[PDB]
From Swiss-Prot, chains A, B, C:
The chain holds residues 1771 to 1982 of 2477 of the full protein. Belongs to the spectrin family. It is found in: Cytoplasm, Cytoskeleton; Cytoplasm, Cell cortex. This is Spectrin alpha chain, non-erythrocytic 1. Spectrin repeats lie at residues 2-104, 107-210. Like erythrocyte spectrin, the spectrin-like proteins are capable of forming dimers which can further associate to tetramers. Interacts with ACP1.
Length: 213, 213, 213
C-alpha cells in the first residue's frame, strides 16, 4: 500500500527525469522538412506524457489518501508528493516550451523556404529577360512582345507573393529577435532582386518596341 | 500562407496519385481465401482514406480563404483547387468501385467453394453406395441398414444445400453476366450428381432391403 | 447462407480453442516484476476477447436466423450452436479465473517484496547500531547523537510499515490460504528482526547518552 505507493512514485519519477532530458533538446531543425519531422516527433512525446497522466494522478490520489489517513511518516509522504508534483509540472512546462520553440522554428523555416522559391523564380527569369534576341523580323518581334506580356502577368503575381513573404519576415522579427540579421538581409535581398528584374524587364520591353517601331 | 498551401496541396496530390494507382489493381483473387484477404486489405485502405480526410479538407479550407480574399493569383489557386478536388473525387470513386468488384468476387468464390464442398461429399457417398456387401449374418445386414438410414437423412440435408447453391448461382447470373457459362455449367453438373447419387442410393437400398426380408 | 455460416463457425472455434490453450497457462510469476509482466499480457488478451465479441455474436445471429427459417438440417445447426456457445463461455470463464489467480499472485509477491524491503533496511541498520564508536570529542559525540536521533525517527516509521506488512500477511492467509507456512514464518521472522533492532538500538543509545553525560 504505502510500499507500492513509493515504488510507483519512484518509477514515475525515473520516467519523468528521462523525458525531461529528451525535451531539453535544443535541436530545432536545419530546414523546413527537418522542423516538420521534429514537430511530428514532439507530438508523439506529448502523447506519451498524456499516456502517463493517469498513473501520475493515481500516485497523487494515493498520496492524498495516505496523508488524510494520518499514516505514520506523513511528513515524508507530503514532501515527496510536493517534489513529485514539482518534477511533473516542470516536465510539462519544458515540453510546452519546446513545442512553442518548434512552432517558431517552423514559421522561420517556412520564410527561409519561401524566400528561396521566389529567388529561384527570379533568377531564372533574369536570365530569360537578359536575352540578346530582339527579333530579326517585324513578325518575330510581335511574338517576343506577347511573350514579354505573358511574363509581366506572371511577374505581377510574384511581386505580390514577395510582399507577403516580407510581411511575414517583419512579423517574425516583431515576435522576437531570433535570426533578426538573417531575416532582415533576406528581405532586403529579395526586394533588391525584384527591383533588378523590374529594371531588366523594362529595358528589354523598350528594346523590343524600338525594334518594331 | 499561399506558399505553404501549394506545398501541402502538392504533397496531398502525390499521395492521392499513389493510392489511385494502388486501387487500380485488377486482382480480385483466385479462390475464397484469396478474395477474403484482398477485402481485409481493401478495408484498411478505406479506413485510411477516412483518417486522411481532415488533411484534404484542411487544404480546401485554406484554398477557399485564399481565393475569397481575392489575393492576386486567384485564378491559379482556383484551377489548382479544382483539379485537386477532382483528383480526390476520382480516388474515392475508384476505391468504392474496387470495393464493389471485390464484393462480387466474394459472392462468386463462395459459390465456387460451396459447389466443391457439395461435390466432394457426393463423390465420397457414391463410393459408399456402390458397395456390394449386403451383410453375411443377420447382425451385419441390420448394421448396414442403420448406416444407410443415417446416410438418407444426411442426403436430405445436402439436397436442400444443393438447391440453395443453385438458387445462389441463379442470383449471381441475374446480377450480371460474369462467369455465366461456368456458373450455369456448375449448377447443371451439381444437379446431375445429385440425380446420380439418388439413383445409386436407391439401387443400394433395394439390395439391402431385399437381402434382409 | 448456410455454407458460410459453418465455415465461420469452424474458424471461430479454432480461434477460441487457441486462446483457451493459451489461457490455460499455470505460470503465475516468480516475483513482483514477473507477476506485473504477466498481468499486462493477460490484460491484452482480455482486450482481444472484447474486440472479438461482435464476430462471435455475428455467427450466433446467423444461426438464429437459420434456425427460425426452419432451414433443413435445423437440428445439426442447433446442436453446433449450443456447442459453440459453450466453448465461448468456457473460454471467458477460464480467462477470468486466470485473471483472478494472477491478482492473488500479485498480492502475494507484493507481500514478499515488502518483507524483503523491511528486512534489508533492518539488516543495514543493525550493523550501524552495532558500532562501538561512541565519540571522541565534545562535538563528535553530538554528531553521533544527531544521527541516532534521525535513525530513531526513521525506525518509528518502519515499525509501522512492518505492522502494515504483517496485517497484509494475515489478510492473505484469511482470503486464500495459499503459502500459509511461508507467510506465517516471514511475519514471525520480521517481528523478530524489529525486536532485535529495538534491543540493539537501545544498547547503542545508552552508551551514547552515558558517554555524553
Amino acid at each position: 500500500m504505502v510500499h507500492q505507493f513509493f515504488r510507483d512514485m519512484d518509477d514515475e519519477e525515473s520516467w519523468i527525469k528521462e523525458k525531461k532530458l529528451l525535451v531539453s533538446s535544443e535541436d530545432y531543425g536545419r530546414d523546413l522538412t527537418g522542423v516538420q519531422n521534429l514537430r511530428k516527433k514532439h507530438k508523439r512525446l506529448e502523447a506519451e506524457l498524456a499516456a502517463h497522466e493517469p498513473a501520475i494522478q493515481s500516485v497523487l490520489d494515493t498520496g492524498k489518501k495516505l496523508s488524510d489517513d494520518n499514516t505514520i511518516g506523513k511528513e515524508e509522504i507530503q514532501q515527496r508528493l510536493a517534489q513529485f508534483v514539482d518534477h511533473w509540472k516542470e516536465l510539462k512546462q519544458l515540453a510546452a516550451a519546446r513545442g512553442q520553440r518548434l512552432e517558431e522554428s517552423l514559421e522561420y523555416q517556412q520564410f527561409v523556404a519561401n524566400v528561396e522559391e521566389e529567388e529561384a523564380w527570379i533568377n531564372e527569369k533574369m536570365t530569360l529577360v537578359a536575352s540578346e534576341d530582339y527579333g530579326d523580323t517585324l513578325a518575330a518581334i510581335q511574338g517576343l512582345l506577347k511573350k514579354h506580356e505573358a511574363f509581366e502577368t506572371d511577374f505581377t503575381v510574384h511581386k505580390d507573393r514577395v510582399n507577403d513573404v516580407c510581411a511575414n519576415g517583419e512579423d517574425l522579427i516583431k515576435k522576437n529577435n531570433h535570426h533578426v540579421e538573417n531575416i532582415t538581409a533576406k528581405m532586403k535581398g529579395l526586394k533588391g532582386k525584384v527591383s533588378d528584374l523590374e529594371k531588366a524587364a523594362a529595358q528589354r520591353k523598350a528594346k523590343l518596341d524600338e525594334n518594331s517601331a
